[PDB]
Design a protein around this ligand. Structure first.
Ligand SMILES: Cc1cc2nc3c(=O)[nH]c(=O)nc-3n(C[C@H](O)[C@H](O)[C@H](O)COP(=O)(O)OP(=O)(O)OC[C@H]3O[C@@H](n4cnc5c(N)ncnc54)[C@H](O)[C@@H]3O)c2cc1C
Ligand SMILES: Cc1cc2nc3c(=O)[nH]c(=O)nc-3n(C[C@H](O)[C@H](O)[C@H](O)COP(=O)(O)OP(=O)(O)OC[C@H]3O[C@@H](n4cnc5c(N)ncnc54)[C@H](O)[C@@H]3O)c2cc1C
Lengths: 472, 481
């Protein structure tokens, strides 16, 4: 009882479920195979959505429990945490959005097959369900969107009990008294902040010498770290972990040393979060038998139409090269299926923004100062602090700055870097500016509403273009 | 030298003399100095920054922010997130202190910016006493003459009075009195359902007042707002507790011996006479240009019927070296509009071309949900005979809005039917105020709906609703709805 299809998508994360919807909208008979109980992939079920929910809820807890609400005349005798209820709010959002994808599939006539997909021919995918039943799909095109998994730390076994990945850390049943996080990238700093805010003593251990992962601008990263340390973060940068021991009393002893060598020490904690990275997931997909070889980092090599070496078999998202982000996977899914229908296929990874949803937030798009130097680009800098922005000052939330990097000969915007309130939303104005090739003067002369945080983006461009802002 | 207050009465020479230190005047003065002009700014009030900083945008946004958080804590929202509190109490004195702290910091900042940029601040009442002369009259009665090549009038606006109802800032208040009420009124009536009125209503509603807005026109939110957005906005505000009497005129108000106020109303067309009682009456029917005792009549600068100073596209009055910008001239009475006019006016004084497109000036309403728009409404496009297409995306389908349990409203995009050019953007929902600036940048380039749809917006953000509404306008269908 095989199914015939034009496009068969393996995986229902941001890349796969959006690709499936768009393919159906373009007229393809479309199937989407998912092995998990719900649709939406890593981002919806154990990723972006649960993490942002806990960041929001823990931020508001900090505002009520700390000094902020009192300073605004909102007085409360006793603020208490109900962690079960906070986790419930998180789970409600996840359930609503995963159900929403199932309805979108029905609305657009995408056939949902529940099982573990394996490519069993150039034009065939077989999905094996939990009970061993099979469903064969004979298909013109195959779109691999199988995503990522957590990168294990050699010698340390994650059990999601006291040694957790991001999945376990998002569902802890009590606030750990003491918590250690291996990895001070985006995911690690976010999860650190959640549990710090809810009462944990948190330490982030990082082999590199800065916070925030790859590609973040160094000046932004140092300033971000300083703000976080004032919030209660403790950082062990330039530090390697040599091992972790699960102890008889339930606690964990973590052995660390200086990254360059020496200064060996041990620190004890109640929960260890292993968050050193993620890697492409292709297990048992049938690639070896087809001859589709992986690159040394486990990614599927693809061409500019996202075709593998077998031209009707495609791959997108966290399973191929480029930034491992939800909106990147989505755009790759859209343009891949547009290309299947004969159209142009374009994504510019220099215009793909990054966001860290701490408070303050961090967001950037385009090039860092380190990248411009390494490329030998002559640039100029404009900065504007949020302390001088009217909306930030009115809200009494004034950490950080906007930094703009501009090309000297043309005034072209080369990069935008935002540390402070509203950075996540603000970077999308910046992404539009980079896609259009805007000059710094262009953005300085656009009438931004007053009072808005976006005026800091305008003023930083004015500084880069004219040399001087108005309000600083 | 850089501050000329009482006792400082020697004559001054300047290239540019700016009368008024509001958003238009103080930015014009800074930019003039940065361009190389010897610049003077005359201000009659105790602080710089005009209506917006002292009694306007800044205090109102501070109270909107604080009252929204009071509502999150005192209502259901914080409890839904596992944040349990025994007793949430309002300390209005402390809330007002946070507001005043912000205003003081920002007014002090302008004075520092004037010093940094070598702008001479003259504290007095400026009158134009010759084609190239302004005389400032100071608090002590002293006078100071400024001989100047150019004059820039930036004298701003005032509250529009209501005949027969005397504002006393006690129980009958303007927006100024409403921003400093000493206690939450049990019942408040607002005459005028425009932007300022709805914002002030929302503040006091959140803090415990029973609020009613009376409006002579048939919609909420002032001039130019899209009618679909306005209707949806009104329905949301009614569920928050607002009561609206649209298409209604006020015939009078009487302060009673017991301190309460009886407001007499009728249908705008006639009939249906009623009386409604309140503890505080806010008179918010508009603002109007302020030019009192400026010397215009003697110069021969006549005003238009609404009191504005007529100017050409370089912002020149009938006297070619005398200019005017901001709330005293035509166009949207908004802070960023006054700022941009001041900048390009002084750039024009320095030899540059002068052009501004009021169709690219955004408007924002800082309620929760917010409202923001830029470009054209459906009503404008219809009246102009423009063929257009519509794309909508509801915030209920946006991942960041749903995750924060903050899902009112939608983004609506209007695109040209044949060319896909973005013609207007209308946002009702969370984050509208910041989001409209992405739309303003798009309009500057004449971008298409497809252009915006193909920009990689971060996930999860509210801005994705803007992306998806453009995708719907361009392709006919969004992804996530
Ligand atoms: C804690 C956390 C926070 C994050 N926060 C953000 C954020 O704020 N913003 C951001 O942009 N990104 C964020 N990310 C990253 C984001 O989750 C990923 O970039 C994105 O989910 C990748 O999309 P994808 O569709 O390529 O893969 P995935 O989301 O990983 O989806 C792959 C799907 O394929 C299924 N699958 C795999 N193999 C098969 C098979 N053989 N048969 C059937 N089904 C199969 C998997 O079960 C899964 O459902 C975060 C990630 C984590 C872990
Ligand atoms: C409650 C309220 C909320 C508002 N919220 C917003 C908002 O969120 N966003 C927005 O964009 N706009 C908002 N506005 C409108 C905004 O304040 C005005 O558009 C803006 O202030 C006008 O700028 P201006 O420089 O033209 O005039 P004004 O700000 O009115 O400044 C004029 C200045 O000139 C001085 N002056 C006048 N005559 C003389 C004289 N002869 N000699 C010396 N000095 C003189 C006055 O004292 C005053 O300081 C709000 C207004 C109110 C009342």
């Amino acid at each position: 009882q095989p199914i015939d299809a034009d496009v068969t998508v393996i995986g229902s994360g941001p890349g796969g479920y959006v690709a499936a919807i768009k393919a159906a909208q373009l007229g393809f008979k479309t199937v989407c195979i998912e092995k998990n109980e719900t649709l939406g992939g890593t981002c919806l079920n154990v990723g972006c959505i649960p993490s942002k929910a806990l960041l929001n809820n823990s931020h508001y807890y900090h505002m009520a429990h700390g000094k902020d609400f009192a300073s605004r005349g909102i007085e409360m005798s006793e603020v208490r945490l109900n962690l079960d209820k906070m986790m419930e709010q998180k789970s409600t959002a996840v359930k609503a959005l995963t159900g929403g994808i199932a309805h979108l599939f029905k609305q657009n006539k995408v056939v949902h097959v529940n099982g573990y997909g394996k490519i069993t021919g150039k034009n065939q995918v077989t999905a094996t369900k939990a009970d061993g039943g099979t469903q064969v799909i004979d298909t013109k095109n195959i779109l691999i969107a199988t995503g990522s998994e957590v990168t294990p730390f050699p010698g340390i076994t994650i059990d999601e009990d006291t040694i957790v990945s991001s999945t376990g850390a998002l569902s802890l049943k009590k606030v750990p008294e003491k918590m250690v996080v291996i990895g001070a990238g985006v995911i690690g700093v976010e999860l650190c902040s959640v549990w710090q805010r809810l009462g944990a003593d948190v330490t982030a251990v990082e082999f590199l010498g800065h916070v925030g992962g790859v590609g973040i601008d160094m000046e932004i990263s140092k300033n971000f770290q300083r703000i976080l340390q004032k919030q209660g973060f403790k950082f062990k940068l330039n530090t390697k972990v040599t091992g972790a021991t699960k102890k008889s009393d339930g606690k964990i002893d973590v052995s660390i040393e200086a990254a360059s060598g020496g200064k060996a020490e041990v620190i004890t904690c109640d929960v260890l979060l292993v968050c050193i990275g993620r890697r492409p997931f292709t297990k048992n997909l049938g690639l070896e038998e087809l001859g589709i070889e992986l690159d040394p980092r486990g990614r599927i090599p693809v061409n500019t139409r996202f075709q593998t070496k077998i031209p009707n078999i495609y791959a997108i998202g966290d399973v191929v090269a480029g930034p491992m982000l939800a909106h990147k996977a989505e755009d790759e899914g859209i343009i891949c299926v547009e290309g299947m229908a004969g159209g142009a296929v374009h994504i510019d990874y220099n215009c793909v923004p990054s966001v860290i949803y701490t408070h303050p937030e961090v967001a950037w798009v385009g090039k860092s100062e380190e990248q411009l130097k390494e490329e030998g680009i002559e640039y100029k800098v404009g900065k504007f602090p949020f302390a001088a922005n009217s909306r930030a000052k009115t809200n009494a939330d004034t950490d950080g700055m906007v930094k703009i990097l501009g090309q000297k000969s043309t005034d072209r915007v080369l990069g935008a870097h935002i540390l402070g309130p509203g950075a996540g939303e603000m970077v999308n104005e910046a992404a539009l500016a980079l896609e259009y090739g805007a000059s710094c003067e262009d953005i300085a002369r656009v009438c931004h509403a007053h009072p808005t945080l976006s005026e800091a983006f305008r003023e930083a461009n004015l500084a880069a273009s004219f040399g001087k802002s108005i309000n600083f």
